[PDB]
Amino acid sequence: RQPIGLVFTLLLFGLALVACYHLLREIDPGALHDAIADVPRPALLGALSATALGFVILLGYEWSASRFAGVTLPMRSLATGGFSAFAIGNAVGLSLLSGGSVRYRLYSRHGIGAAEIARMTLFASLSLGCALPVLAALAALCDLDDAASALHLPRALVAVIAIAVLSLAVGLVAFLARHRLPGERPSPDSLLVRLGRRSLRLPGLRLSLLQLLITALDVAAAATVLYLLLPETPPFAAFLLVYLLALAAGVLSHVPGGVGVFEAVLLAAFAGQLGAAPLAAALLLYRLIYVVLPLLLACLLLLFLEARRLWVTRQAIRVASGFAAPILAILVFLSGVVLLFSGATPAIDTRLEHLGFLIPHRLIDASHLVASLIGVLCLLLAQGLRRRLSAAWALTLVLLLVGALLSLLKGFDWEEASLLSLTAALLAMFRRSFYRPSRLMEVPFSPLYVGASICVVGASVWLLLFANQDVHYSNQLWWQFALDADAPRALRAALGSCLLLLALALGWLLRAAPPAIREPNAEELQRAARIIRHSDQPDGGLALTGDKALLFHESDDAFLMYARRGRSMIALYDPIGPAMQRAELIWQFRDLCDLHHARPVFYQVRAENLPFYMDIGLTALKLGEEARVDLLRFDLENKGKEMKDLRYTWNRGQRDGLALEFHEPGQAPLDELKAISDAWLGGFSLGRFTPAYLNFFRIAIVRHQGKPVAFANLLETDSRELASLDLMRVHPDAPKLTMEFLMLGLILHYKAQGHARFSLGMVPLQGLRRFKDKFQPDWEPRYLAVPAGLDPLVALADTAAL
Amino acid sequence: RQPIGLVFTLLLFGLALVACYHLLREIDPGALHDAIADVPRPALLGALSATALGFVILLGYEWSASRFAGVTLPMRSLATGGFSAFAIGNAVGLSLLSGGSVRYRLYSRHGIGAAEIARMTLFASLSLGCALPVLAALAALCDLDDAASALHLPRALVAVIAIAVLSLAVGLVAFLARHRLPGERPSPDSLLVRLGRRSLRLPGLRLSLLQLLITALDVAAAATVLYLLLPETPPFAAFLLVYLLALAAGVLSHVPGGVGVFEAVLLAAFAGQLGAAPLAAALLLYRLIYVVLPLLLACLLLLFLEARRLWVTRQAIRVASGFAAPILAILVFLSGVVLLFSGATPAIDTRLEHLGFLIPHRLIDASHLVASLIGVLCLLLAQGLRRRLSAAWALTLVLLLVGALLSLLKGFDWEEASLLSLTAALLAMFRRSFYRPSRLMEVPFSPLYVGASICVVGASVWLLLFANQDVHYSNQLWWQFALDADAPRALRAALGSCLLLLALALGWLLRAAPPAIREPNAEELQRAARIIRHSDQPDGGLALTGDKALLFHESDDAFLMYARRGRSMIALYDPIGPAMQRAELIWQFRDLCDLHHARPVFYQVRAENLPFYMDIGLTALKLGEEARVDLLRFDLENKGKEMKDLRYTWNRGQRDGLALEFHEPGQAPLDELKAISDAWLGGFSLGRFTPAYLNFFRIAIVRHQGKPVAFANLLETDSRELASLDLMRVHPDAPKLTMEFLMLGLILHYKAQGHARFSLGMVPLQGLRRFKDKFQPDWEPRYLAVPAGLDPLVALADTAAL
Ligand SMILES: CCCCCCCCCCCCCCCCCC(=O)O[C@@H](COC(=O)CCCCCCCCCCCCCCC)COP(=O)(O)OC[C@H](O)CO
């Protein structure tokens, strides 16, 4: 899927480049520059305003999603989320930090469910995805002659196509209206439809109409931006029609920005009618104003919020797994783009002639080549920054500033140097955000980033051909070292960048295979047990069963237990140790998973570590509820119906002759345990009955008039914060209150030693819930972490099987 | 002492500046530049060669010290040490990284004693310090007329002065030869002299003569360097005489480089005879070639060795407390100097006229001012880098590269930008060397660094006056913003730098006083005990006595116990916890000590942490020996006279009716303990007898036929690595073998539980040594850490009193 989808997009981009080259054959860069300069100031200020209007309409797009999913949020929060998600989706879609991710990051602070957000994003996407053809047909129906002229098709054909589209639209609307279940409504604005297999959620009539108006206003404003930039204006209907088609074509192409394809379509539509140069200039200004500008605004906004949050709340925020690393990766990538493009384009003559005196002539050529290499390194270090490396942050901070220096020593291009330096400032300001002390060579291969790198290099070479089209091909251009000669510098640069990218890509591809997963040995198990003791978490006990492999921190202070199942690696709980060790461990696991081409999954995680999973790109699903009784409040001289039932149970148990005794680890009656375990059997998160496992923990045994009837090992630490029990077996013939006596006896015993809390157990998603509730415990949600895209049930079913 | 010595040096520098200003009044920068250009290539290549010759002779200087102190080292090591110590001493003497420090760092890897190195340095210093006047007199005796003309004094006066000096020299030599103790000789080349109070160590005749030849060749080569640079050459005798005097005057002035004063004296000597401009040019080239160049070579050498050591030995080196932070602090300081000086000097007209087109005219003035501020910040962040901060490393890495950018946007001064960038490269390459995550605002005030900052600012202003001496004073110069106007830019720069330095200096001086030292409370004590348990070191037990204050790491994982005594804070042992926590703690202590204006001292430290103390500027003295028995090798069925004596003791003890029993912490007979403690009493590193202290540890009591006779608390951890005993009391009336039975019983008991090692105790600097040796233990040295300068006995005596 991943390589196929990459290759498909890459080829589509490549084709669109070739199309644009063969379409702008007549135009030379001089003409284009003149066309760009031609545009009047009121037109620019108009487009700059229509951008704002069109982005304010995109807030309503988020409002419709909020209403559909039934999410109550503050208006300031909804606005911020809407703007930032749309801005960053539209520009760098699906490559870095998609709109969904930005929604899910921003809205998880308010404590909205992952399913709700997911639904919001899906609605926001499919809204445009399904309302695009309808608006295209509606626009086509106005002035068929103009539309036919634009598309270069017969009037009859486009007419019947429009009629066929609107007929299919109303037909589907009627069909879903037929299967409308009454009564139940998940939200005020939501219908449920029943087909037979699954119940699907569709918008209501009012919401559907309101979003369709919103979509209409959105695409209108978007098209108007591009309309104002054109000196000569074709009929609005046809223009809008083609814009819609082009937008569609760009989105389907799965090209990050829609660049290459969108421009190809517009140019093909109005190659002759509007000319090439004025259109190309309008397209560039459109892309700079409507895509690039908002993205940079969003980048700065979210950086600002992150910095403000860090400054205000200093103590609570410890590890910093916020919203800086992804933005900085984006800005760094853009920087590398800016370096590579500059390297392709020839310098200004005036700047070169001034510089020629100050700097030696060969240094310029050297500077230029190195600056091109640095550009490619900046492309590939985006991934590093994304994964919160510290090495990557150090290297990138150096390169961005060296690159900014060479940008002044290549042709005194201060516009480049300014941006590179500004980026390097922001990168240095967020120093804490990059903590991981891992090796850069250990970063996994990422097809996507390499794909994007190749695309950018392609676009640089395209720009090289288009810029240096006034020089004849010659073999002597390669060696030609002189000031005025721009084309040699570009050629050298392009070759150097192409070789360096190829080298690094091949080096990453051909690397030593990772070691296979093995079970832990005696030493590892002992270390794991040591870690568990010197910690708060007693749930770590299931590490010692020697059934699931162990990932150890470099400091051997904290560890994480995981097991491979099919194509997905599952981690049993949160990592065991201090917070700073936990974050590094969660990343370490993600790295490992990626190396082995497996989905990372975290089973039964607490709420406190959720943002660390959100970082590495997981989503929290409500798995179950975990009960824990607080022994400080709980006392044997308290009131409450359940409490009176418990004391009655305890008193009867004592009178009947039930005795509970605790055996230290090692000194256990293995014969009696084996007997009861066999009796219970006759009649991953489980805990085996191997003696080795049992000798680690102290076992509480209850006896009924002397004979051993039931037992339950106890997970403990050296601290007296929390205590839990994993394995717990009872004899089928035992009295019904015997298990409850054992259970309450445990609670009282831990009260005696003075443990703050006592972990009862988890209920997923009836009897177990009631039984746990009968002790009057404290409930706490337990989550499941799965990749964000689409893996809701497959992973849960697979884990349930395991 | 510190403020007085600072003010004295600062005033001497100030005066020497004023002297040089009033002496080079006639010369304008044009004439000076012409004088510098005048010097021929053979003269430069001659001076560059005579520098090398003179530095090769400085190796023999180290050789004489090695022989005197009696230190056997490899020739490569001695060479490296000699070169680097002399190079860095001569340039940045006593301000940053003195020659002594560099010797003591480089030679402590081979495992040479601190007393030996100290002696080596003292000899190397005093050699020149005492051989300078003798050579001055010897030179004076040759051609009195020329010497008299040079000094502008009567021939008779200089003659009798020379005669008086040589008479005093031979008189002192005879006087020390009189009190020559025969027989004993610490080294082959060393005499001991007895005056009555203390025995002093003087060189032998052969060594004295050889070093005096070495000193003669050294100063000759040094003077020759400056001789070749002069076009017209005065008589060698007189010239050498004045050079000697000037060198002396510079050294006594305690000016880091000898700059200001040395030049003043030379200029005053040959103001009229040789002219000002040619002499000034010779002096500049001398300073650049003989001082600055070697320093930069040494800086690079030692950086290279550090990098090579890091690359080769990756695993053993963990925390990196090597030789990078001091060098980088030096290079950063030099960078800031280079920025400030450039800012004072006016730009080249050609470069300004080229730049005037590219850059807006006001930007140049802005760039120039900011670059001057950045220069002053680079001055003050040297201290930060020195103290291995990470904040300081991040900030400095940014500033050096921004400063390098502004250096190209001020007057396109690429020579500056190259150096700043090269420094910023090296600083980024040694990223690990700066680990401390402390706040920059928390750095203590340092009079020395501020003193050096003020000096540099002074020298910048001096350069400003001397460079812009072709412009008349006017009030309108401040506001004058134009390209060609250089003097306004310099004036603004100088003012901006002066205000920023004043502001920061005052801000550091006026700061909230540090909190006073308090005793630990119940919570702190409990935390300390927790830390001790989850650790290897059982010696941490004496923390719990609640007698000495506790410094806790930010992570509350490791801590360090210290107590103030008079004017020196003593830390009781190494910090307790992991290595990474230990380094930060040792620094944290140094910070604290500096805040309270107290000498840091570390009492009883192990060898493994020595380099962490060496970093913060301490020296290890051999305090005593600590015995520890290894229970793995030791067994009850072994052979050896001492072992047979032990088993005989054990068997007799058992037969007599001595019984040893171990009581858990809390469950102890306090009555019996109090009784025995009182009986023993009747008849900081001590351990009190307060019940609170005793309830923490398990007490071993021995009984003689039922009655309690002796006891000894046991320091333990949860691990079974090491065990120790602090407090140990016996009844006066007890049998002589009873204490030995208790002692051997402990050893056997710990064998039973299976503890690897068992700490016996320390003997400082007779009976105790024999008693410990009778168990056949393993000896390990125990050190004392005291400030490097001169605090050998005062601290030890003060600690002994406490
Ligand atoms: C050729 C145009 C018409 C064809 C339309 C379709 C083509 C589709 C396929 C090709 C994709 C577009 C290729 C062209 C890109 C822009 C080319 C360009 O103009 O590049 C300039 C330089 O390249 C760029 O500026 C490209 C930037 C593109 C990306 C924009 C990102 C901006 C933000 C970066 C991060 C900022 C960080 C700080 C703030 C957070 C060089 O021209 P100049 O005259 O402006 O400069 C001359 C000299 O070299 C220097 O002055």
Ligand SMILES: CCCCCCCCCCCCCCCCCC(=O)O[C@@H](COC(=O)CCCCCCCCCCCCCCC)COP(=O)(O)OC[C@H](O)CO
């Ligand atoms: C005035 C000389 C005669 C008087 C002698 C006695 C005076 C004593 C009191 C004053 C002390 C000396 C003051 C003069 C310093 C040098 C002045 C100078 O020439 O400064 C130049 C610039 O300042 C310096 O270069 C000063 C450097 C001094 C320190 C040297 C350190 C070098 C190493 C730094 C670290 C390197 C890092 C990388 C390698 C590890 C500016 O002149 P320029 O024509 O060379 O340049 C013009 C334009 O501004 C730029 O080209």
